[PDB]
Design a protein around this ligand. Structure first.
Ligand code: MG
Ligand code: MG
Ligand code: MG
Ligand code: MG
Ligand code: MG
Ligand code: MG
Ligand code: MG
Ligand code: MG
Ligand code: MG
Ligand code: MG
Ligand code: MG
Ligand code: MG
Ligand code: MG
Ligand code: MG
Ligand code: MG
Ligand code: MG
Ligand code: MG
Ligand code: MG
Ligand code: MG
Ligand code: MG
Ligand code: ZN
Ligand code: ZN
Lengths: 129, 63, 151, 102, 225, 81, 25
RNA sequence: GGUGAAAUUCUUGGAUUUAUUGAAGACUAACUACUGCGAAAGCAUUUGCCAAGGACGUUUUCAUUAAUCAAGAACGAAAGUUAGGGGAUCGAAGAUGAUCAGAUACCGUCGUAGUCUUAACCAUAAACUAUGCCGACUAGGGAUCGGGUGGUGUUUUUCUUAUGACCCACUCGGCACCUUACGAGAAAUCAAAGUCUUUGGGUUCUGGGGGGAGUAUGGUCGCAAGGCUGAAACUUAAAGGAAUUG
RNA sequence: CUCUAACUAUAAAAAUCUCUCUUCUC
């Protein structure tokens, strides 16, 4: 190792307002939390890829100022009883994180998947639209 | 489409019959390879039919 | 393929050989076979176990082939036939076992239904053994009589 | 009348199966009438494979995949383009649509 | 998205001036003992940081500790317990798989067998171990399914359970981890059930941890350097 | 198939069909004479025996109950009856 | 109309008639 | 947060996310299939105990003990009702925030009863395969589950063998499936919905145009909800089934 | 006469309609 100071990128991409939240190896120390809704106006393009792009650029600048040069991607969907499929923004967030100089190591998916627990929201007939 | 020259050429190519025999054990030094079953077929038919036995390794390929 | 009390359709059985007479290879004596049957019965064995013992450990294909009489018939001739027929006794034992399991746990409903089925079968077999007069006409099945007959 | 001899359920000898929820509309639908699609894909698309490869430590990372079995409802399956209406003589065929690529 | 109804129910600084970096030191059972760095608030006399580090759980890929890539899909959690000053010492806390590999081996048309066992190691450490196995299509099976009957599954679960109890009760998590790295337990479990059923992909995943006796100083310092 | 003999079908077809389904139903089982290495007594056993048959001279089992027919005791030598 | 809701309307008519009879029983 | 889009709501008393953990209750993902068990409902974490059961093997035992069933009985999804326990999620009522001409509906956020249970009731479902049960025969093709036979079969490894796991062939039983009409249907279609004008294997229940109406009344069961039984007066020339072209 | 690989991903609102229907034989 050439002293690549590591963090974990830990992207969280729901179907609205994706999250980019970098931390150290332990994860108890939080730095550069800036999110997707942090940087867009329409209140609904928070999940848009451009929101995640801007958030990723901001976290990259902040962590590069910090001293961390490489990050660990921990992609998380909304998880739980919900759709638990990755959000549209988090992919662009990861691409922009890999763009801005930062080095990439050990991409992982850490979405919370249940053992068919805690009956899903929506009723028996579900969302009718 | 077709015409006289083309159909004549097709017929001439069709009439091709090789002079050398492609049967009657012209190859493999007058020996043809079989397994036991058709050998017993030949035997029960009451015919001489020079053969060459070979087990077919009943284990089938996994494909 | 009827399965009186279920939806089964099996036909697993045994095909009795065509020849009624003794097998050619058997060398034992009919009187000795009868003595063996008597001894097995005196040991306290039901006719089916007697037949299985004669078929496995010895060359007895079946008693009627060798002796000319059936196992229960042979026992009855010597006065060793049980007062309750073997199949009815085994049904009684099964019924008392399921009733014990029921009274040790109430919520099991499937075993309750199975006990109902077993009791229906017991009633049918008792009716048959009553019209043939094997059992006295006052013979019947209630609680604590099955335990008394089994014990 | 019978539109489907299989009734669409594909149950034939159970009486009742345990229902599952739709991924889009959360429709409580039986697990066999719950048309299933196994989405296996790359966690990074072909659009960013080069970028990730150039800017990643651990030369020749395995680039792990993501696996998810999606339990759609049937209304969403018709609408979200997963499954399509077919000719009554084409409903016979149950083989998947002929190996998308070889 | 500035919209905020200010339903609140400058004294601003840069929190990074009052912070610094500690180093994570792995157990000697691993090769690459230099794990990484951790960001910590500066030490204060009233509230010493050294209290704050202990209890931290770092999560590192196993291949990051041994250099190879055969251990790519595993993952190890280390516990921060003792701080030597500008460098802290970490003990084993737990083990797990990566979800990618787990979903990669959980495929259709084969029965997965799970063996779960809670045991006590040679020392007072109390562990819980999960083993996962998958029935294997034979190298001649023209039949396309590879299902296993319930009797075979129960026998396999019994065998795996007894093997795990044996191999935990006979060693400490120092030796148990030094045994987990070359995954010889997987091979032993596969070999012990060769007659019952093929059992492809016999793996030990999510080695949990439930108790720790007091502190165990001497072996902790002995486990490092 | 339209014309075919049922009174005299091939013996291969006889062994093909199930028991209880032949022209006249006959069992597929048979008896065996087993010798145990212990003594010289010849014991008559059944192919589909249901009990741990032992010689009367020595307490050594010669067969073993099985869902189908008997599995012998790894050292007894038999002859089909 | 659905047989379900015709059934329910009949049940509500029986509601009122049963309450009236219980008052005057 | 959330959405088509918004808003209600929570937030510098620092929410949303971040790491360890702890509590509660429910559930048993992925394995999960034209696969299994059960009388039907229904049944999916591990282990032990309790008894039960189908199928197969059987040169074992009794010898018609059987098939279907008015009367009588046992179980009977969800919902609902009495009490005691819990009280996570989701959510009838309700509270609102939207959309609309209206919206006390669908989208959203909270949210009692309920969902989860121990006793006691309830006995209804598109309780569906809308196909009663038992029995016989009739046509070809593969697979699949449980059992059993044989292989001079293959890997297994414990030197060889015994198993196990496969491979090939056969058979019994089960959920099933493909083709076809040479049979049946008004056809959709059915390998039974065939062996029915060339009309009779045994047997139970139900229907006689639609509506009124599964209503009233009278019984009977139920604490209640309601269940079982169940017409007529009158009105009507159709209602309905399958398929063909638009 | 010889083979098991590639992949995504939208749901705004839209109520209603009066007459009158008429032969097919060489
Ligand atoms: Mg729609
Ligand atoms: Mg229709
Ligand atoms: Mg379907
Ligand atoms: Mg069934
Ligand atoms: Mg917080
Ligand atoms: Mg499970
Ligand atoms: Mg199964
Ligand atoms: Mg009745
Ligand atoms: Mg309830
Ligand atoms: Mg209560
Ligand atoms: Mg409302
Ligand atoms: Mg409103
Ligand atoms: Mg709502
Ligand atoms: Mg709620
Ligand atoms: Mg009804
Ligand atoms: Mg009906
Ligand atoms: Mg009428
Ligand atoms: Mg009506
Ligand atoms: Mg009344
Ligand atoms: Mg119609
Ligand atoms: Zn849906
Ligand atoms: Zn001896």
């Amino acid at each position: 190792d050439n002293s690549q100071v590591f963090g974990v990128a830990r992207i969280f991409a729901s179907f609205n307002d994706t999250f980019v939240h970098v931390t150290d190896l332990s994860g108890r120390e939080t730095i550069a939390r800036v999110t997707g809704g942090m940087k867009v106006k329409a209140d609904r393009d928070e999940s848009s890829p451009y929101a995640a792009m801007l958030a990723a650029q901001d976290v990259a600048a902040k962590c590069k100022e910090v001293g961390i040069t490489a990050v660990h991607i921990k992609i998380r969907a909304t998880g739980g009883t919900r759709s638990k499929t990755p959000g549209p923004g988090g992919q662009a967030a990861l691409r922009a994180l890999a763009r801005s100089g930062l080095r990439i190591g050990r991409i992982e998916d850490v979405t919370p998947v249940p053992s068919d627990s805690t009956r899903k929201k929506g009723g028996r007939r579900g969302r009718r639209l | 489409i077709s015409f006289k020259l083309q159909e004549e050429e097709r017929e001439r190519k069709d009439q091709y019959v090789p002079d050398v025999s492609a049967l009657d054990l012209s190859h493999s030094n007058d020996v043809l390879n079989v397994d036991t079953q058709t050998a017993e077929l030949v035997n029960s038919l009451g015919l001489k039919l020079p053969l060459s036995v070979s087990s077919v390794s009943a284990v089938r390929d996994r494909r | 393929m009827g399965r009186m009390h279920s939806k089964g359709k099996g036909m697993s059985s045994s095909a009795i050989p065509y020849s009624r007479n003794a097998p050619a290879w058997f060398k034992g004596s009919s009187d000795g076979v009868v003595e063996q049957i008597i001894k097995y019965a005196r040991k306290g064995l039901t006719p089916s176990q007697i037949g299985v013992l004669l078929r496995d450990a010895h060359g007895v294909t079946q008693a009627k082939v060798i002796t000319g009489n059936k196992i229960l018939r042979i026992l009855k001739s010597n006065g060793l036939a049980p007062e309750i027929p073997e199949d009815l006794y085994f049904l009684i034992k099964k019924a008392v076992s399921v009733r014990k399991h029921l009274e040790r746990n109430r919520k099991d409903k499937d075993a309750k239904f199975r006990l109902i089925l077993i009791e229906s079968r017991i009633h049918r077999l008792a009716r048959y053994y009553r019209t043939v007069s094997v059992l006295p006409p006052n013979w019947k099945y209630e609680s604590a009589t099955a335990s008394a007959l089994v014990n | 009348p019978k539109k489907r001899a299989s009734n669409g359920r594909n149950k034939k000898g159970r009486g009742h199966v345990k229902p599952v929820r739709c991924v889009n509309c959360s429709r409580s639908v039986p697990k066999d009438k719950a048309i299933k699609r196994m989405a296996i894909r790359n966690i990074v698309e072909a659009a960013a494979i080069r970028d990730l490869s150039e800017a990643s430590v651990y030369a020749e990372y395995a680039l792990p995949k993501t696996y998810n079995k999606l339990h759609y409802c049937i209304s969403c399956a018709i609408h979200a383009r997963i499954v399509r209406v077919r000719s009554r003589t084409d409903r016979r065929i149950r083989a998947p649509p002929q190996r998308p690529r070889f | 998205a500035v919209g905020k109804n200010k339903r609140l129910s400058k004294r601003v600084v840069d929190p990074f001036t009052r912070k610094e970096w500690y180093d994570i030191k792995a157990p000697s059972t691993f090769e690459n003992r230099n794990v990484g760095k951790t960001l910590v608030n500066k030490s204060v006399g009233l509230k010493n940081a050294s209290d704050s580090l202990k209890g931290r759980v770092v999560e590192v890929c196993l291949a990051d500790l041994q250099g190879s890539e055969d251990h790519s899909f595993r993952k190890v959690k280390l516990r921060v317990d003792e701080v030597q000053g500008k460098n802290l010492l970490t003990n084993f806390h737990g083990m797990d798989f990566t979800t990618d590999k787990l979903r990669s081996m959980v495929r259709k048309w084969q029965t997965l067998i799970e063996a779960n066992v809670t045991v006590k190691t040679s020392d007072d450490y109390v562990l819980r171990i999960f083993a996962i196995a998958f029935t294997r299509k034979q190298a001649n099976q023209v039949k396309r399914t590879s299902y296993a009957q319930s009797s075979h599954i129960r026998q396999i679960r019994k065998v795996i359970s007894e093997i795990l109890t044996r191999e935990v009760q006979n060693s400490t998590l120092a030796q148990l981890t030094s045994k987990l790295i070359p995954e010889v337990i997987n091979k032993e479990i596969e070999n012990a059930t060769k007659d019952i059923f093929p059992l492809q992909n016999v793996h030990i995943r999510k080695v949990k941890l439930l108790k720790q006796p007091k502190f165990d100083l001497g072996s902790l310092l002995s486990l490092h350097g | 198939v339209l014309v075919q003999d049922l009174l005299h079908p091939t013996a291969a077809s006889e062994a093909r069909k199930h028991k209880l389904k032949t022209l006249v139903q006959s069992p597929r089982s048979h008896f065996l004479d087993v010798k145990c290495p212990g003594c010289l007594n010849i014991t008559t056993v059944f192919s589909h025996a249901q009990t741990a048959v032992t010689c009367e001279s020595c307490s050594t089992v010669l067969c073993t109950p099985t869902g189908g027919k008997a599995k012998l005791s790894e050292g007894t030598s038999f002859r089909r009856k | 109309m659905r047989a379900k809701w015709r059934k329910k309307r009949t049940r509500r008519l029986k509601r009122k008639r049963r309450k009236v009879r219980a008052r005057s029983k």
